[PDB]
Amino acid sequence: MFNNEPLEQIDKELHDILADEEKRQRETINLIASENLTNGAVRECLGNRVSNKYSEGYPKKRYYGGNDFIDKIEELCQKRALEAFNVSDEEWGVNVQPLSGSAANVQALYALVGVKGKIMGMHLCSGGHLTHGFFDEKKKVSITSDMFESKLYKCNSQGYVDLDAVREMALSFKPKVIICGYTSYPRDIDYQQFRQICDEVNAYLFADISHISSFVACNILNNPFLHADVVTTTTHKILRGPRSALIFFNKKRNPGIEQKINSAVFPSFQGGPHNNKIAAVACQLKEVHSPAFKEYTQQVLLNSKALAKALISKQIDLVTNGTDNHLIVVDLRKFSITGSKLQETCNAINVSLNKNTIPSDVDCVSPSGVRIGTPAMTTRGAKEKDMEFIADVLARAIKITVDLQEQYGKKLVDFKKGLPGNAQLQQLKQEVVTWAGALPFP
């Protein structure tokens, strides 16, 4: 007593939008630093009948029975995540139930410090996440500012983590956790120097490596596992898995953190886990360990180097003047256009990128840059040589944006009027569509 007709026939209205969405992804230069494209196997897991099953609790300690095949999957996902990040299951544990990045961070923070607890992280404007304590004078925007007591450290005028600022704040504020690892930070991190500050004031070290996860697993970038008490990561960005998250905790440095963190996820915050997610992560964690995937991650860095280098070659300014990872932030101040304008322009040509703040910006409205990343396009087969084109396309857009701002004026309402019925954008969109459209597409 159900309907087994295929999606096409049962809901034709929806199937059309999805086939459109499918086409727009195929036909887009995707420089969203946090996006990727999942393979069929990860998606077959996501659509598996395992999500039918309620499995509250943990493996071998479920409230309900019938969880024997579920337990094998959750155990196989946990092991593979400790294997993938080069940690012994004797020293490190992993929770695989957070439904996404923001949940895992709120969860892990609560575990360490509890309500009214004291935390530090990078300000949103300098490159931190909302879940790293973000507030404004008007309102506590994130639960991490309101259910904890948060204070925020900035990057210097050049865009680097300023450790002398972290120490000045840690000793006066005396927090219980300091968060590093970021959302738009183009360089590697000094986890050791962070440990020195945290050891000084009896604070926990929290590394959110969601943007750089693969770099950490593949030993290309610095390993926070040698220093951090807690490591969180999403599974959907550079790691190229489903939308989910992992919480890592160091047992040796902190006895009884295992209990604190597992009970924070359930039953403190979540109910039933989503087993199709857990299955899908297991599927990608296998691939994350293979030598094929090390090559891809190397390739993500080689594309990001090439891209920053080519953008500098066309006299485009980059925050910190370059990158140690998959991401770049462009300082657009010399062209007197906002980051929002270039986004609008880039969307008109099937270029996905996003607006992003720079050190000179005081407010989050009217951000002066854009963030770009290489994992998505790297996933679609682009090589070092294709980065010149992406650079040419973005230069062309910066220029088109300058022309249109002078014609229609400097107000976002007026600017957009310019975008439709501009012959250069249609010209540029087409070029984008032909090159992108034919790239390998999982």
411: number of Cβ within 10 Å: 9
User: Binders of ligand 8UC among 263-282, rule CB under 6 A?
Assistant: 267, 271
Among 41, 48, 53, 54, binds ligand PLG (CB under 6 A): 54
- Total number of residues that touch a second copy (CB under 8 A): 102
Distance in Å, CB of 194 to ligand 8UC, minimum: 19
276: Cβ contacts below 8 Å, ≥ 6 apart: 45, 46, 47, 48, 50, 51
Residue 402 contacts which entry, ligand 8UC, ligand PLG, a second copy, none (Cβ below 5-8 A, type-dependent): none
Q: Which stretch binds ligand PLG (CB under 6 A): 166-174, 203-211, 410-418, 429-437?
A: 203-211
Q: Phi, psi at residue 117, to the nearest 5°?
A: -75, 160
Residue 326 identity (one-letter amino acid): H
**Is residue 367 a contact residue for ligand 8UC (CB under 6 A)?**
yes
Q: What angle do the packed helices 339-348 and 423-437 form, to 10 degrees?
A: 70
**Is residue 234 a contact residue for ligand PLG (CB under 6 A)?**
yes
**229 and 203 Cβ atoms separated by less than 8 Å:** no
Q: Pick the catalytic residue: 80, 187, 237, 277?
A: 237
User: Binders of ligand PLG among 417-436, rule CB under 6 A?
Assistant: none
Beta-bridge partners for 161: 155
Q: Which stretch binds a second copy (CB under 8 A): 29-37, 81-89, 196-204, 314-322?
A: 29-37
89: Cβ contacts below 8 Å, ≥ 6 apart: 79, 82
**416 and 74 Cβ atoms separated by less than 8 Å:** no
**361 and 335 Cβ atoms separated by less than 8 Å:** no
Residue 208 contacts which entry, ligand 8UC, ligand PLG, a second copy, none (Cβ below 5-8 A, type-dependent): ligand PLG
User: Binders of ligand 8UC among 140-159, rule CB under 6 A?
Assistant: 141
> What gap in Å lies between CA 109 and CA 373, rounded to an integer?
28
> What gap in Å lies between CA 395 and CA 130, rounded to an integer?
31
Q: Pick the catalytic residue: 234, 345, 378, 401?
A: 234
Among 57, 86, 100, 220, binds a second copy (CB under 8 A): 100
**Is residue 22 a contact residue for a second copy (CB under 8 A)?**
yes
User: Binders of ligand 8UC among 312-331, rule CB under 6 A?
Assistant: none
**Is residue 34 a contact residue for ligand PLG (CB under 6 A)?**
yes
User: Which residue lies nearer to a second copy by CB, 229 or 386?
Assistant: 386
**Is residue 101 a contact residue for ligand PLG (CB under 6 A)?**
yes
Among 25, 193, 422, 424, binds a second copy (CB under 8 A): 25
User: Which residue lies nearer to a second copy by CB, 20 or 91?
Assistant: 20
Q: Which two tokens stand for residue 110?
A: 């609560």
Distance in Å, CB of 136 to ligand 8UC, minimum: 7
**Is residue 56 a contact residue for ligand 8UC (CB under 6 A)?**
yes
Residue 306 identity (one-letter amino acid): A
The answer to whether residue 91 is catalytic is: no
Q: What angle do the packed helices 339-348 and 387-408 form, to 10 degrees?
A: 110
* DSSP SS3 for 131: helix
The answer to whether residue 243 is catalytic is: yes
Q: What is the DSSP string of 70-131?
A: HHHHHHHHHHHHHHHTT--TTTEEEE---SSHHHHHHHHHHHHH-TTEEEEEE-TTTT--GG
Output b/e per residue, 26-52; b: 16+ Cβ within 10 A.
ebbbbbbbbbbbbeeebeebbeeebbe
The answer to whether residue 53 is catalytic is: no
**429 and 350 Cβ atoms separated by less than 8 Å:** yes
Q: Which residues bind ligand 8UC (CB under 6 A)?
A: 56, 63, 124, 127-130, 141, 183-184, 267, 271, 354-357, 364, 367
Q: Which residues bind ligand PLG (CB under 6 A)?
A: 34, 54, 100-102, 105, 129, 131, 182-183, 208, 210-211, 234, 270-272
* Active-site amino acid positions: 54, 56, 208, 234, 237, 243
